[PDB]
Amino acid sequence: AVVTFMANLNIDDSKANETASTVTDSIVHRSIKLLEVVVALKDYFLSENEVERKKALTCLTTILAKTPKDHLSKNECSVIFQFYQSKLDDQALAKEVLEGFAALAPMKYVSINEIAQLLRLLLDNYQQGQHLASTRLWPFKILRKIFDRFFVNGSSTEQVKRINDLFIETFLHVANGEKDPRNLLLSFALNKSITSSLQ
């Protein structure tokens, strides 16, 4: 418990990769530290300033990404809640929760409805891609992972069909405003893949 507390105090000093490796190794080895770290960080971002909130969220997303193999299904479902109420209550920090969605996506203990709730909510309240280069850049990343993991027809379309059609408009949701080449490559590659993959 003391190790988690000192790591959470030191991350405020921006130790960068020093604390990330230690926290991820501890989580992997113990496989029970996820609840301890989330409850320890619960009051960490409770402060009014958004700086503390995003500094906690970036490391939480990093440690979630580095440990996607093992995670409780009920805990997995509980993960989404605080994130989308973080979307709803506060703004100007949703990018970190976008990398959080990208990190929690590879987890395969997701119910048929929970992934449906994710895909429905991710574009509705936020409306990603309104302005600024990165805010329109990350949505391509998150859609790339969500396509590569489960949206692709790995198991045909026995129960995924509901996402398929709507996916079209979210790809259209952030479009007609990309000028830097890397977003252009993202759009071209995803469209080329989706022409063959999608029915």
Give 136's contacts (C-beta < 8 A, 6+ positions apart). Answer: 128, 129, 130, 174, 177, 178, 183
State this model's resolution in angstroms: 3.3
Alpha-carbon span 108 to 106, nearest angstrom: 6
How many alpha carbons fall within 13 Å on the CB side of residue 57? 25
Q: What is the DSSP string of 129-180?
A: -SSSHHHHHHHHHHHHHHIIIIIS-EEEESS-HHHHHHHHHHHHHS-S---S
C-alpha distances in angstroms, 147 versus 14, 35, 58, 133, 177? 33, 29, 23, 22, 22
Alpha-carbon span 63 to 168, nearest angstrom: 31
Q: How many residues does the chain have?
A: 199
Task: Give the alpha-carbon dihedral of 41, 46, 49, 53, to 10 degrees.
Answer: 30
Angle subtended by helix axes 50-66 and 33-42, to nearest 10: 170
Alpha-carbon span 179 to 198, nearest angstrom: 26
Q: Which residues of 64-94 are buried (b: 16+ CB within 10 A; e: fewer)?
A: bbbbeeebeeeebeebbeebbebbeeeeebb
Alpha-carbon span 32 to 83, nearest angstrom: 21
Say if residues 87 and 66 touch (Cβ distance below 8 Å).
no
Name the experiment that determined this structure: cryo-EM
Say if residues 80 and 118 touch (Cβ distance below 8 Å).
yes
End-to-end CA distance of the chain: 50
